[PDB]
Amino acid sequence: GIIEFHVIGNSNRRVLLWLVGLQNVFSHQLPRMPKEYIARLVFDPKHKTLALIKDGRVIGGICFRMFPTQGFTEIVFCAVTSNEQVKGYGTHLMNHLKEYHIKHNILYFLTYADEYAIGYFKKQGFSKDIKVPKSRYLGYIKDYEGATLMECELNPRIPYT
Amino acid sequence: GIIEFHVIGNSNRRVLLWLVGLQNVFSHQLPRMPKEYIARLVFDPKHKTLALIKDGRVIGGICFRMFPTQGFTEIVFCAVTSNEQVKGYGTHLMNHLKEYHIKHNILYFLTYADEYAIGYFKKQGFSKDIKVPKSRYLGYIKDYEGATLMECELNPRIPYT
Amino acid sequence: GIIEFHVIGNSNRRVLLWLVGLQNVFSHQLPRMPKEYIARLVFDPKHKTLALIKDGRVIGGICFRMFPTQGFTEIVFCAVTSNEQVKGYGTHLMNHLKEYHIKHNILYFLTYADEYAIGYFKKQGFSKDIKVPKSRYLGYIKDYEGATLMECELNPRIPY
Amino acid sequence: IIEFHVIGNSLNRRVLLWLVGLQNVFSHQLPRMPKEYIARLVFDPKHKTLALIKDGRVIGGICFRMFPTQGFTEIVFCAVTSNEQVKGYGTHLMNHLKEYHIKHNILYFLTYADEYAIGYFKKQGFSKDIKVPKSRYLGYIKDYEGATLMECELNPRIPYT
Amino acid sequence: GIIEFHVIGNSANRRVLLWLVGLQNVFSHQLPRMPKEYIARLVFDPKHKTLALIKDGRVIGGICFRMFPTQGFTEIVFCAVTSNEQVKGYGTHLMNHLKEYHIKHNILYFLTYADEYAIGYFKKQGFSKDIKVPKSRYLGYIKDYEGATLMECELNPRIPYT
Amino acid sequence: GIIEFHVIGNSLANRRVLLWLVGLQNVFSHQLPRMPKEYIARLVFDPKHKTLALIKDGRVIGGICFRMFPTQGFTEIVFCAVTSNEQVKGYGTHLMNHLKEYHIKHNILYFLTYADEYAIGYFKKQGFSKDIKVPKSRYLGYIKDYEGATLMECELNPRIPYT
Amino acid sequence: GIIEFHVIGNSLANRRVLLWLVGLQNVFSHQLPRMPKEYIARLVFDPKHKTLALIKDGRVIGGICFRMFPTQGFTEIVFCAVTSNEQVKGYGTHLMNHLKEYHIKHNILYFLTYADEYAIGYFKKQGFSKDIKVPKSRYLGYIKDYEGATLMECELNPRIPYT
Amino acid sequence: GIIEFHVIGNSLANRRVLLWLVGLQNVFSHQLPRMPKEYIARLVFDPKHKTLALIKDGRVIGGICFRMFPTQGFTEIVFCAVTSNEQVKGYGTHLMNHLKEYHIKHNILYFLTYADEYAIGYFKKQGFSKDIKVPKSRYLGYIKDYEGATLMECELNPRIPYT
Ligand SMILES: CCC(=O)SCCNC(=O)CCNC(=O)[C@H](O)C(C)(C)COP(=O)(O)OP(=O)(O)OC[C@H]1O[C@@H](n2cnc3c(N)ncnc32)[C@H](O)[C@@H]1OP(=O)(O)O
Ligand SMILES: CCC(=O)SCCNC(=O)CCNC(=O)[C@H](O)C(C)(C)COP(=O)(O)OP(=O)(O)OC[C@H]1O[C@@H](n2cnc3c(N)ncnc32)[C@H](O)[C@@H]1OP(=O)(O)O
Ligand SMILES: CCC(=O)SCCNC(=O)CCNC(=O)[C@H](O)C(C)(C)COP(=O)(O)OP(=O)(O)OC[C@H]1O[C@@H](n2cnc3c(N)ncnc32)[C@H](O)[C@@H]1OP(=O)(O)O
Ligand SMILES: CCC(=O)SCCNC(=O)CCNC(=O)[C@H](O)C(C)(C)COP(=O)(O)OP(=O)(O)OC[C@H]1O[C@@H](n2cnc3c(N)ncnc32)[C@H](O)[C@@H]1OP(=O)(O)O
Ligand SMILES: CCC(=O)SCCNC(=O)CCNC(=O)[C@H](O)C(C)(C)COP(=O)(O)OP(=O)(O)OC[C@H]1O[C@@H](n2cnc3c(N)ncnc32)[C@H](O)[C@@H]1OP(=O)(O)O
Ligand SMILES: CCC(=O)SCCNC(=O)CCNC(=O)[C@H](O)C(C)(C)COP(=O)(O)OP(=O)(O)OC[C@H]1O[C@@H](n2cnc3c(N)ncnc32)[C@H](O)[C@@H]1OP(=O)(O)O
Ligand SMILES: CCC(=O)SCCNC(=O)CCNC(=O)[C@H](O)C(C)(C)COP(=O)(O)OP(=O)(O)OC[C@H]1O[C@@H](n2cnc3c(N)ncnc32)[C@H](O)[C@@H]1OP(=O)(O)O
Ligand SMILES: CCC(=O)SCCNC(=O)CCNC(=O)[C@H](O)C(C)(C)COP(=O)(O)OP(=O)(O)OC[C@H]1O[C@@H](n2cnc3c(N)ncnc32)[C@H](O)[C@@H]1OP(=O)(O)O
């Protein structure tokens, strides 16, 4: 097939239906996220989603929230559909999302990871060492007591894509 | 009777008299809080009140001020009228306010609690450990020095109502 | 005379000529300050000045800069005119400034004081012990090597 | 005939061409930074550039990002064109930048200087001893590669120009 | 270095605003016997203009004047140069620019009050104690001063002053 | 108490002002009986005239009706009256002071008036004199020369406060 | 029959007003045969001129043409005529009285006019004097000085009912 | 050989008028060489000025630049010139007469001008006198002085056709 990347969000019909498809993949791959909570965040206007499309069908995505006053982005949800995982799609999504944030000159990623996702973010260059000060993210990024906070710092000079 | 909840504010005649109704309950149940000060805030545009209506009549409410630039909300007055207390009206009021704040992406409450109501705030999940940075609120919330600063974190995945 | 207190600032002819009177009084009483620096601050939109008027003319005031997101107010200029000093006017000015900030939930004054005025700030409750962390005020207040950083702590009050 | 203009992409052909010209001098004198990255910053509305013009033509400039919410300005690019160096143009540029900043009530400069240029900043008054809290700049100023963080404190009573 | 002349007045942006403060300062300081508030009232009066002498962005002198086109003259209200810039010909240069300005606006008479300590400066600017303009034309329009000498200057519009 | 001062006049439009103007017409007229009431009403309600009202507890207790001649560089004082049971308390002097401050703001620094014999002492205490410096060509025919009245002039000082 | 007085002129229109101005130009010209009809028509239709028309049974039987100079504080009387069959019945005097009442209510108190020899006695009886109180600088070159004519002035009392 | 007269001025003006004012500035410049040509241009193009242009075959051959002061009741004569090859043919007199006729219809009846030895005799033949009836207070600081020049006045009669 042919693969497309598209940053979208609920600020168009294909956008709306692509968003419903993202809420489906997020809900299926993250069974502990209440479905209504996914849809509330995914359809929220100051959230954006990097969609991974295969033949006009939503097969993955990274839902994120830019905090340019506080100088970082929240990674909200990460999913590739089940039969399309372990093929590098996750890595091309993250790399794409990184180059986009270069172009908007935000250079920091914050996210919470459970024990089953920590390996993925580590392999995208995320660390437990948080350089961003608490005074800047607490109360803006959604806390997850029980999961590890991870951070990734981008180089506004190297080609990610 | 017929119980209703409404987040009102002064930014209808029906709403005007509900605000006077809330200023009345707040004043009676907080008798050393100067009435003019209670009126000044309840009729302030940047403050809002969650009225509890029973059979068309105001019997309770929580008056608050959301600081979405700082990520928390300040709780200002809580009261139920004398002959409706100890029936759970307090709890449903707070639960409703939690739900209102989930849907508005503000997940932290801050309040001062006197020696007469800290047991209520404890039972609504408020703690003396403030996880919000002192710098986030020191210039925003009024300091009722003498009373105890208390904090409530909201889980946006749990249903509260 | 008729004594008035007004908190004014550059966004009206009356306010305007009051800011010029204030710049006059700050400049004449602090003559090693550049006239153009005082004027640039007094007419800065995010500074305010508490003007003390006696019979429609400025006789003193306090120019300040509030930092709400930081929990204090910087005190930039304090002057009373020469022929009206030693009369409690400096104390009424600072007192009014305290009430203003107690309404507005700012409970801390920060200021640099020199050897000619440090006693007057002491008498208004300033000390050399700075309880505001350096991380809250550094880079926000104009640091002045050679003068003494001093702090005043206000008691909060419920209106009426 | 020498002129100094603070310019930038607002929200004018002579302005637009000067910005193409600055972007060229920055690209040529800072070979490390990718030309595409220099353009996004020089043409960003939140960034400004102080242009040094010698007979209608750009020979130097300083690209800066003001953070008045934090009390400092980031100095992003410094360059004088090779044919015009060691003629005191860099000092005249930094002086005008200083005057521009005392009129705008910002009194700290923060920059990352590579080992090759630390001597120049040192002679414009910069120090390696950083009086701003780390928590105040981390994530706003682009952390640079291997460069030294430097700070310049301004005194709003000197006429720098 | 970097001398400029600007006719400004209060209609004001903050550059013009801060310059009027500078002028009011220079006037106030060189005219100690004029009340600061009176100088400020007139400098910021809309029907008043000031020719500012700007030296490297900073005010160092000026002439505050008030044009009376229907009366056919202009009132010279305040002249001052900062103490450390006096006796370099700056005062003369201000007056010449003010004469060139009024030639183009077809006002060819200046009226001013000078005290014994200022008569010599206006004399060397071409002013005279012989007042050709009639009293009916200026009395109660220009602000009289007790003890000051009234002085008049007549301009030639066929002569270039700057 | 609650003394107020208001400069009012017919605009060539408000009922509070209109009843105030009638109060002034009455006070002027009762204090100046040998002046036609119609003439006093005509001037008070004339648009290019103005009156400085002295309000005490909402009721008119005095005022000064004047005509500004900005083109001629002076203002004419037309009527001055304080109601009888409020005289000799400084109200006539406070009225003249406020009227002075008002004119300094409009760069009119000369008052002219034709005082009758009963008023000369009041005008003298407010700084008027018989030595008229405004040349006759500037005021003649613009103010009426009532035979037997005394032309009196007051010069205002724009550097000094009057209120 | 029905006598009316109307102050008219050629403004910035009415068919009745316009025929009256012809009637006035006719009366002035016939009663002043030694002034050129063309000149009488220029002034009578000049917009800065006004005529107080005496109307009897809808017909023009006389009038006064004047030029108000409010800036200079006087009015110029330009032409006075009553048609011959209606002279010596007080109409000339009523016109002047009406003209006086009109200027009183407009705050103008001085009339000026250049009378010829045959009109001195009429102006004398209407209160004019050869003794001119307005300074020469106020009227020279605003009113027209004809050689051989007598300047005459009338001073108006605004406290006097003229009509 | 077809001669016209037009009152033109820089109205704050089409192509024809603009090239005529430039002509007039050229002619005034050549015939009055002690006047800076930039001074003639400033006044000739001044909106408060006007010029009576003498046009012969579409070509400017003369004119009179004048400034009307209606509040003052006179007009200043600023420049008079006829081109050299058209002089002493009565052109300068038709110009002054056309200008007199223009001014009576605008109710201005005095002319003031400065003239040195060379020009004085021209103005005398147009009826100017060295005896000024306009008082000094009316024209001083309104008309441009020239020392070395004689102030001259001319009185116009509005019962007279000048052209
Ligand atoms: C944003 C807030 C969050 O934390 S959401 C939590 C993350 N989301 C989920 O875990 C949902 C379930 N997982 C998935 O949908 C996918 O496996 C995700 C995590 C999106 C990765 O997509 P995928 O298409 O497999 O990408 P990929 O082929 O590039 O694999 C990357 C390499 O990393 C390694 N890895 C180690 N641990 C993991 C892990 N838990 N999930 C995925 N990959 C992991 C894999 O070996 C893989 O290959 P390699 O190591 O580069 O050779
Ligand atoms: C924000 C600043 C403030 O306003 S602080 C002051 C709060 N307001 C007052 O004190 C006003 C007077 N009191 C009241 O209006 C009500 O009692 C308040 C405190 C609002 C509670 O409403 P109410 O409907 O009675 O409570 P509820 O039935 O939902 O009971 C919930 C549980 O709380 C417990 N509790 C312990 N201490 C108190 C207390 N001081 N007041 C009320 N309840 C208290 C009750 O026992 C009850 O316990 P449980 O559910 O049986 O486990
Ligand atoms: C914010 C940075 C600054 O502005 S620091 C510079 C302050 N300004 C100056 O030094 C300019 C010249 N001085 C002044 O304008 C006035 O003296 C100032 C300092 C404003 C005080 O106003 P003033 O009304 O005269 O004083 P006050 O009558 O209210 O007296 C209050 C008590 O303070 C005492 N005091 C001790 N040292 C001083 C001093 N240097 N200047 C003035 N007062 C001082 C007075 O004795 C008086 O004592 P007490 O109340 O009798 O116990
Ligand atoms: C983060 C912002 C950045 O751009 S960091 C990298 C700085 N930019 C570069 O290195 C680009 C290439 N160089 C240039 O464009 C110019 O030479 C720069 C560095 C801007 C200086 O301007 P320029 O006109 O040459 O300097 P100037 O004539 O005003 O001389 C001032 C004094 O500085 C001294 N200096 C010491 N080290 C250096 C150095 N590495 N480069 C330039 N000047 C340096 C010079 O000797 C000069 O001498 P002195 O003060 O009389 O002793
Ligand atoms: C109240 C009404 C008003 O208009 S204010 C009255 C005048 N104002 C003042 O005196 C204020 C204080 N004085 C000053 O600010 C300046 O000295 C003034 C008077 C403005 C002159 O400016 P300044 O730059 O010094 O003059 P300049 O360098 O062009 O010198 C020109 C020549 O004038 C002569 N002169 C005679 N008397 C004076 C005098 N009182 N002040 C200054 N110069 C004066 C000087 O000899 C000077 O030199 P020279 O004659 O050309 O060789
Ligand atoms: C041009 C307008 C006119 O028709 S001239 C008419 C002026 N009005 C009248 O004559 C009306 C009758 N009188 C009044 O209405 C009031 O008395 C007037 C004149 C307005 C003064 O008001 P009133 O408030 O009483 O006066 P005041 O208390 O402010 O001042 C009183 C001081 O003035 C002195 N004075 C000397 N002669 C007179 C006088 N003829 N009328 C009033 N005051 C006069 C008194 O000695 C008294 O002296 P002191 O300064 O109070 O100690
Ligand atoms: C220079 C350009 C002008 O417009 S000169 C203005 C005068 N007009 C003329 O001379 C033109 C022809 N005359 C007339 O139309 C009328 O006679 C004029 C002058 C307008 C008078 O109108 P008429 O209706 O007669 O007035 P009137 O009846 O009110 O007479 C009042 C008393 O005035 C007396 N009077 C003394 N001298 C004269 C005189 N020269 N012309 C007219 N009346 C004059 C008469 O005796 C008459 O009677 P009595 O004195 O009350 O008993
Ligand atoms: C600021 C001052 C001003 O308003 S401009 C001052 C005058 N302008 C000039 O002198 C410019 C050069 N001269 C000319 O352009 C013309 O010759 C002027 C003066 C405008 C006359 O026009 P022009 O067409 O030649 O005259 P005209 O034929 O209508 O009449 C000629 C009659 O005038 C007599 N005259 C006596 N003295 C002079 C004189 N100085 N200039 C011209 N004419 C003069 C001639 O003898 C001749 O006499 P007559 O009337 O025919 O019997």
Side-chain angles (χ1 to χ4, degrees), chain A residues 34 37 40 44 135 138-140 142-144, chain B residues 69-71 102-103 108 131 136 153 156-157:
Chain A
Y37 171 63
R40 218 180 311 128
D44 175 90
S135 69
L138 191 155
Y140 302 118
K142 313 231 160 35
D143 203 335
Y144 290 84
Chain B
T69 36
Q70 320 293 285
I102 275 169
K103 305 219 102 216
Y108 283 94
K131 312 182 140 200
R136 191 63 70 69
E153 184 180 2
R157 288 143 251 134

Side-chain angles (χ1 to χ4, degrees), chain H:
Chain H
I2 310 121
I3 287 190
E4 332 161 34
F5 290 84
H6 304 280
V7 171
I8 67 191
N10 187 21
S11 328
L12 54 82
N14 63 11
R15 182 71 29 80
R16 203 145 308 279
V17 161
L18 249 54
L19 298 170
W20 275 344
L21 293 158
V22 178
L24 290 154
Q25 189 266 358
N26 286 9
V27 184
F28 290 147
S29 210
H30 188 251
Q31 298 289 303
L32 309 158
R34 309 307 126 205
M35 310 261 197
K37 61 194 35 182
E38 326 75 36
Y39 169 78
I40 304 174
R42 190 146 41 75
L43 304 195
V44 161
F45 282 83
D46 179 72
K48 276 173 190 309
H49 278 65
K50 289 178 182 60
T51 318
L52 176 66
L54 183 53
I55 311 298
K56 180 169 170 164
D57 262 293
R59 194 184 136 242
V60 169
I61 71 154
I64 307 190
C65 180
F66 59 101
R67 214 290 215 190
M68 305 198 278
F69 292 92
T71 81
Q72 310 299 120
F74 65 82
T75 277
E76 185 185 9
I77 308 296
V78 173
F79 307 128
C80 287
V82 176
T83 198
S84 282
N85 283 321
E86 299 284 19
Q87 284 176 22
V88 278
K89 301 177 175 165
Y91 281 138
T93 297
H94 289 102
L95 272 167
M96 192 55 82
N97 283 336
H98 265 85
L99 190 68
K100 295 180 180 189
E101 185 55 39
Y102 176 86
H103 271 80
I104 68 194
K105 310 168 129 216
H106 292 90
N107 285 297
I108 296 178
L109 305 167
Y110 283 90
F111 284 156
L112 294 169
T113 198
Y114 280 98
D116 64 359
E117 280 172 324
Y118 306 121
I120 280 196
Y122 162 60
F123 285 102
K124 285 192 216 172
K125 285 194 186 164
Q126 313 311 313
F128 284 65
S129 157
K130 289 175 182 127
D131 190 20
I132 325 298
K133 291 201 312 155
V134 173
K136 177 190 308 183
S137 79
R138 188 90 58 79
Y139 67 75
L140 188 133
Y142 296 111
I143 60 161
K144 314 253 206 301
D145 206 341
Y146 305 70
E147 186 46 85
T150 293
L151 179 61
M152 318 251 288
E153 179 186 88
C154 176
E155 202 189 332
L156 314 180
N157 179 16
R159 304 145 179 219
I160 280 311
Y162 282 104
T163 46

Side-chain angles (χ1 to χ4, degrees), chain C residues 33-34 37 40-41 44 47 134-144, chain D residues 68-71 102-103 105 107-108 131-133 135-136 153 155-157:
Chain C
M33 306 268 317
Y37 169 68
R40 183 194 326 132
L41 290 199
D44 179 65
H47 286 64
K134 330 85 201 157
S135 66
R136 248 162 246 160
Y137 66 79
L138 259 165
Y140 291 103
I141 57 168
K142 352 309 190 189
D143 183 350
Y144 287 159
Chain D
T69 165
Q70 319 245 357
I102 75 185
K103 291 163 176 28
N105 270 286
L107 298 183
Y108 290 77
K131 295 286 103 206
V132 198
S135 85
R136 180 95 46 80
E153 208 190 308
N155 175 19
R157 283 82 152 283

Side-chain angles (χ1 to χ4, degrees), chain D residues 58-74:
Chain D
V58 175
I59 55 154
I62 301 179
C63 189
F64 53 99
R65 212 286 213 204
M66 296 171 108
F67 292 96
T69 165
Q70 319 245 357
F72 72 86
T73 282
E74 180 186 14

